[PDB]
């Protein structure tokens, strides 16, 4: 297929938000529903990041609902060919909310994604996330 910068951005926006949209009940379904956003190596790294962080443990323990909204528009920091595949480094700030009847906590995070073109044979979108990095401010 074909990819536009603007299309890739809107897509990166969706993927970033989806990653922070789950709860103590549906986490497994939501987790798995997102695998399509990722490339082979991206899925491994994303899963690894999930295990290292304690987030899922607190969400379950405190039985929270996680949501997020884009704080500013996503931007392409850099684009070009990496290892034979056209790629985009996309960054977007977000406001994440962890809440329940008893708790309400918010975080300003910045998501940085490496997005690469892949075969539509395995990923109909034609692109996938190879690296998913979260940080503050």
Numbering used by the authors: 71 to 207
Quote the paper.
DotI is a 23 kDa inner membrane protein essential for intracellular growth of L. pneumophila within mammalian and protozoan cells. DotI has one transmembrane domain in its N-terminal region, followed by a periplasmic domain13. DotI is conserved in all of the identified type IVB secretion systems, including the conjugation systems of R64 and related plasmids. Structural analysis of the periplasmic domains of DotI and its R64 ortholog TraM demonstrated that DotI and TraM are structural homologs of the T4ASS protein VirB8.
DotIC crystallized in two distinct forms (Form I and Form II) under different conditions. The structure model of Form I (space group: P21212) was refined to a resolution of 2.2 Å with the working R and the free R factor of 19.1% and 23.5%, respectively, and Form II (space group: I432) to a resolution of 3.5 Å with the working R and the free R factor of 17.9% and 21.6%, respectively. Form I and Form II contain eight and four molecules in its asymmetric unit, respectively, and the structures of these molecules are almost identical. DotIC is a single domain protein composed of four helices (α1 - α4) in one half and one β-sheet in the other half. The sheet is highly twisted at its center with an interruption in β1, therefore can be divided into two parts, Sh1 and Sh2. Sh2 comprises βs, β1a, the C-terminal half of β2 and the N-terminal half of β3, and forms a large cleft with α3 and α4. The cleft of the molecule in the Form I crystal is filled by 2-methyl-2,4-pentanediol (MPD) molecules, which is included in the mother solution for the Form I crystal. DotIC forms a stack of two octameric rings in the Form I crystal. This asymmetric unit contains eight DotIC molecules that form a head-to-head stack of two half rings composed of four monomers each. The crystallographic two-fold axis at the center of the half rings produces the two octameric rings.
